[PDB]
């Protein structure tokens, strides 16, 4: 369904873009790495030193795809 580059909302009210979609090193299953319009996230695209995508500090967040709306 979802694709890298897509405009999305996290929990229906945090706008951003998908920058990563896949499995990761930090937790099982599928993850979407999002760059958020506002710096209200958790990371810069990296988690525990592992780089999944690149953005400015706190503009990145990883969430389950089921939490996204296109």
């Amino acid at each position: 369904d979802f694709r890298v580059g897509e405009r999305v909302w996290v929990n229906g009210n945090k706008p951003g873009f998908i920058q990563f979609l896949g499995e990761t090193q930090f937790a099982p299953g599928q993850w979407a790495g999002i760059v958020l319009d506002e710096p209200i996230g958790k990371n810069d695209g990296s988690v525990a030193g592992v780089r999944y995508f690149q953005c400015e500090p706190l503009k990145g967040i990883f969430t389950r795809p089921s939490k996204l709306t296109r």
Partner: peptide, 8 residues
């Protein structure tokens, strides 16, 4: 905030 629970 809470919305980020279960996120990384």
């Amino acid at each position: 905030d809470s919305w980020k629970d279960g996120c990384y």
